[PDB]
Amino acid sequence: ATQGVFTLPANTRFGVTAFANSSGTQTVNVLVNNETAATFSGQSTNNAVIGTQVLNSGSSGKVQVQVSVNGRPSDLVSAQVILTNELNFALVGSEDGTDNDYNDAVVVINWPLG
Ligand SMILES: *C(=O)C[C@@H]1O[C@@H](C)[C@@H](O)[C@@H](O)[C@@H]1O
Ligand SMILES: [Ca+2]
Ligand SMILES: [Ca+2]
Numbered sequence: 001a002t003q004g005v006f007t008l009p010a011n012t013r014f015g016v017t018a019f020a021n022s023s024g025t026q027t028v029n030v031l032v033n034n035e036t037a038a039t040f041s042g043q044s045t046n047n048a049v050i051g052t053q054v055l056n057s058g059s060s061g062k063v064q065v066q067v068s069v070n071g072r073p074s075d076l077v078s079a080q081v082i083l084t085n086e087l088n089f090a091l092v093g094s095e096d097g098t099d100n101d102y103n104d105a106v107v108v109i110n111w112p113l114g
């Protein structure tokens with residue numbers, strides 16, 4: 001199944017934050033309406049924040065997260081969780097190698113803001 005694609009409400013500010021837990025440098029691409037809107041690049045094995053940014057979901061509300069390591073797309077897992085019908089988390093994990101901890105790049109999208 002497709003992973004890392006989320007339908008957000010339209011024209012809504014959302015936060016996107018990425019953490020690294022891998023030997024390889026992580027490149028995190030965030031697309032709004034199929035256009036790249038933010039790129040994070042960093043390396044860490046201590047869950048360091050390699051990027052955090054506020055974006056607008058625009059008129060489509062389609063947000064897609066992609067992760068690339070060693071020039072190879074990482075395998076992704078994702079889901080969306082909603083608390084008390086108001087607070088939204090779109091979550092991505094990604095695996096760049098063989099150990100399947102799926103934490104190599106971890107991406108958290110949360111909304112609403114403000
Ligand atoms: C290469 O070593 C694989 C890679 O980096 C490791 C330190 C570990 O974080 C592993 O999960 C990651 O895929
Ligand atoms: Ca891994
Ligand atoms: Ca890892």
Ligand SMILES: [Ca+2]
Nearest residue numbers: 111112113114
């Ligand atoms: Ca508030």
